[PDB]
Structure 1
Amino acid sequence: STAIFSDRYKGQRVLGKGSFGEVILCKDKITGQECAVKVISKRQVKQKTDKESLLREVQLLKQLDHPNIMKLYEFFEDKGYYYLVGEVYTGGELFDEIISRKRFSEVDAARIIRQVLSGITYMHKNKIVHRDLKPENLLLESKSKDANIRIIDFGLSTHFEASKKMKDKIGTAYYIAPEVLHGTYDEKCDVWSTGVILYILLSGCPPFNGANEYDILKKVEKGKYTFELPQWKKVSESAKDLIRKMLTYVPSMRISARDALDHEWIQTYTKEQISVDVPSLDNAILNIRQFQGTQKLAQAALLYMGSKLTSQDETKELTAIFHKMDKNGDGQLDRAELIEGYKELMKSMLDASAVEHEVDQVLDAVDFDKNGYIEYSEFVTVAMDRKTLLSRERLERAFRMFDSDNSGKISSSELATIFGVSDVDSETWKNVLAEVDKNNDGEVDFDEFQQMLLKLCGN
């Protein structure tokens, strides 16, 4: 009697979108235990290994326990997806916590990096490689200041092929080890990624950077970086030494995770008491806030355009479904039929229970209610506006957050940075601007930026 995910869990709400698919907050129908479930769509994500190999990894992952590694509880598979059920953590991404601080020192960075290396060391002893380690994969257990770090997605890269969509690979290029690019890699790739993360914590700038994905990769593959930024003068020699050892090009010469834990710098700056010399890295924290805001705005822009393309698709599809269901030809439908077509559209709505409630939120939202005969046309408008909300609202939020001086505007230099990170061709976005505002003087407000994005997705 093979078990069934939706027999055991109900979806509560969406937690986010991660590598390989959506993460949904779920609840055990008997025990009330809340859990974070990564749902991998077999249609969007191709497998690299065979079933046998994936089930063996899962079985191993369930038996490992470390304070800095996300705990996996359960694994299910049906016809259309894979479901990975883990512990839910509520502290958010590390860097989003870091940028809320007004003080940040080498002690804070060593506390951070020690946890990461401790989790990586443990996983490498069990022959699991992350490969895709980056800031987004570092979650905080809770919103508390003293919260432990939990690494997510350890081992998935081995069995599933990563999205080639830019909206999914923003800020992947900065962290990947050069041997991963060339195809022969081992567990040392996780030390390199960690090394990049440490460089960023102490300087707030990526060691390997450029205007677009491909320029960043060209820098990584060459392997050259420097410590000539002014804010490195404030950093201990010990920290730089550890960095050089983590960023060693040839993997066989690069320090192991385990050895990195024992390095003088980690031993010195994680002793809770001794502040022998501990200034605050003010420039770094502000660089990280700029870095983070840029990454988040580019991401939000791509998802805005993606949501706008989805809403074109689904509006037309839903209308054609309702049209054919309308046997009267009067343009009206009852509740069950609305539910039926919306389910037919299907392919957060993990069971029939999820669908009926979304429909009910819209029928309530249909302003005032006459029961029996519903104008299919207007239900479509409202169902779809609902779907785009999260993404337009999020777009404005990200715009406001990027605009740190509250100027209401972003410069064309800033647009170049954002569009380079979003991988929108240079000639393409300026042609678009020229058409939105024929009189602009090198800056756009929120509405203009939004109008630009619409034009860049064929509207």
Structure 2
Amino acid sequence: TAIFSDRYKGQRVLGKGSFGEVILCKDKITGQECAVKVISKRQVKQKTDKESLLREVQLLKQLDHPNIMKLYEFFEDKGYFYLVGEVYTGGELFDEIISRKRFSEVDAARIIRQVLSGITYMHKNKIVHRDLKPENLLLESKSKDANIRIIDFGLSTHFEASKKMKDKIGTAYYIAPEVLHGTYDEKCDVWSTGVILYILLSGCPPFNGANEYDILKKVEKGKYTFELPQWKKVSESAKDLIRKMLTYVPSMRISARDALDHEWIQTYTKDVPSLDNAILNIRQFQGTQKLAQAALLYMGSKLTSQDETKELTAIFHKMDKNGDGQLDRAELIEGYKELMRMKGQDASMLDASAVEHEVDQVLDAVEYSEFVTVAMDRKTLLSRERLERAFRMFDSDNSGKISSTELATIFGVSDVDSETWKSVLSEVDKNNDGEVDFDEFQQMLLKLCGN
């Protein structure tokens, strides 16, 4: 048994992924930068025993492929699992596709050839992804010709999926029908890739709906069509591959290996017009998915900040002996560390030295009542500006407003009941204009999480 904090130190928060938060860490001797996924044992349950998890981790470390994330180390303590691996800076595949001006079948074929090359390799080693989606397709670096890296391969076998809607955004579109009923094998990853290929060439999911349960209903039935006008500009071989990848019965569905030898992958990687209607639809889709996620994370961060404000105020009130409302530096460190000992250690706060630094950063700006307000506003600082940034990206015409039809789509992806947000809208919008600005939209989210 080795300790994580003795080998690695936290540098900055990279983001939130499946089963936990991702941190940019650095080796205290060699100085090698690494991405670390911190899985909380309280929030995430184990689907397998300790000996099964250690055997797969050991295998996953020895595996190597240019389109699969490299895992380096694994650590464990009383309340956490630390998966240490290679860090990628190119960002998510779909976030890059919306920034580029043109996109065609040659670009889509080059993307899916890499995804299949990685999936084929991991299938030969008896490892299944299960939760493959665009969010799990990161680009290795900030370049035009950057390789794709599939992340979280094999973690679904050992960790239970979250039931919280903030952790289930954009999952129902790509999940295979057999995974919903229980009997599934490695062919579920081909379906998930088939769905991604369908969106790359049209910009609309094949199985869609006004809410999570409606999307799963269409997926379970397994029916889709190429009746949208944008499919006329796409080739017949691209559609044939999608037909074979989105076959309902997994035994009849094409394998990852045979999908590489398909005429479409062989012809478009070894005329081709730009798919302009597809890029505009991927841009709208990505913006809608990111605003829905930012809304749920904003509502979540606000709720945790209220709980932590009252808990941190109760800790400092007990420590205040004379009752003057003031405390020393060393006292404030003991109280802030006590919050992590009671309400679970923070992802950014890797050790006691990280807490001492965070307390000093609050004291530079900032009376313990004033210290709580600043310390807790810095926790939400990322989620508040991410919501505003996501609202500005969603509002592509820069009108400053979001229509009622757009709210229904946003709240639909966030799985907020139709009658609940329409009732909350009436509490702020009393003139019924059928549209809201950012402040009004933020006020709706605050009312939805008890404010």
Q: CA deviation at 1:201?
A: 0.2
The separation in 2 between residues aligned to 1:157 and 1:417, in whole angstroms, is 29
The separation in 1 between residues aligned to 2:7 and 2:118, in whole angstroms, is 30
Q: CA deviation at 1:143?
A: 1.0
Q: CA deviation at 1:437?
A: 1.9
The separation in 2 between residues aligned to 1:171 and 1:329, in whole angstroms, is 50
The separation in 1 between residues aligned to 2:297 and 2:359, in whole angstroms, is 24
Q: What SS does structure 2 have at the residue aligned with 1:252?
A: coil
Q: Deviations over 1:270-295 (max 9, x none)?
A: 01xxxxx1000000000000000000
Q: CA deviation at 1:344?
A: 0.5
Aligned residues: 443
The separation in 1 between residues aligned to 2:101 and 2:281, in whole angstroms, is 13
Q: What SS does structure 1 have at the residue aligned with 2:62?
A: coil
Q: CA deviation at 1:33?
A: 0.2
Q: CA deviation at 1:440?
A: 2.8
Other-structure match for 1:34: 33
The separation in 2 between residues aligned to 1:354 and 1:278, in whole angstroms, is 53
Unaligned runs of 5+ in 2: 340-347
Unaligned runs of 5+ in 1: 272-276, 367-374
Q: What SS does structure 2 have at the residue aligned with 1:84?
A: strand
The separation in 2 between residues aligned to 1:336 and 1:349, in whole angstroms, is 17
Q: Deviations over 1:184-214 (max 9, x none)?
A: 0000000000000000000000000000000
Q: CA deviation at 1:330?
A: 1.0
Q: Deviations over 1:343-387 (max 9, x none)?
A: 110xx0010011011100000011xxxxxxxx1110001111111
Greater Cα shift, 325-334 or 193-202: 325-334
Other-structure match for 2:46: 47
The separation in 2 between residues aligned to 1:25 and 1:162, in whole angstroms, is 24
Other-structure match for 1:352: 352
Q: Deviations over 1:207-232 (max 9, x none)?
A: 00000000000000000000000000
Q: What SS does structure 1 have at the residue aligned with 2:156?
A: coil
Q: What SS does structure 2 have at the residue aligned with 1:184?
A: coil
Q: CA deviation at 1:247?
A: 0.2
Q: Deviations over 1:164-188 (max 9, x none)?
A: 1100101100000000000000000
Q: What SS does structure 2 have at the residue aligned with 1:333?
A: coil
Q: What SS does structure 1 have at the residue aligned with 2:432?
A: coil
Q: CA deviation at 1:3?
A: 1.3
The separation in 1 between residues aligned to 2:429 and 2:284, in whole angstroms, is 27
Q: What SS does structure 1 have at the residue aligned with 2:35?
A: strand
Q: Deviations over 1:142-162 (max 9, x none)?
A: 010100000000000000001
TM-score (norm 2): 0.98
Pairs within 5 Å for 1:9-408: 9-271=8-270, 277-345=271-339, 348-366=348-366, 375-408=367-400
Q: What SS does structure 2 have at the residue aligned with 1:314?
A: helix
The separation in 1 between residues aligned to 2:94 and 2:161, in whole angstroms, is 23
Q: What SS does structure 2 have at the residue aligned with 1:129?
A: coil
**In the alignment, does 2:430 pair up with 1:431?**
no
Q: Deviations over 1:308-333 (max 9, x none)?
A: 10111000000000000111111111
Q: Deviations over 1:223-264 (max 9, x none)?
A: 000000000000010000000000000000000000000000
* Backbone CA RMSD of aligned residues: 0.5
Other-structure match for 2:345: none
The separation in 1 between residues aligned to 2:379 and 2:322, in whole angstroms, is 29
The separation in 1 between residues aligned to 2:191 and 2:438, in whole angstroms, is 38
Other-structure match for 1:369: none
The separation in 1 between residues aligned to 2:114 and 2:382, in whole angstroms, is 33
The separation in 1 between residues aligned to 2:430 and 2:230, in whole angstroms, is 41
The separation in 2 between residues aligned to 1:162 and 1:23, in whole angstroms, is 17
Q: CA deviation at 1:388?
A: 1.1
Q: What SS does structure 2 have at the residue aligned with 1:255?
A: coil
Q: What SS does structure 2 have at the residue aligned with 1:22?
A: strand
The separation in 2 between residues aligned to 1:125 and 1:415, in whole angstroms, is 45
Q: Deviations over 1:46-67 (max 9, x none)?
A: 0000000000000000000000
Identity, in percent, stands at 99
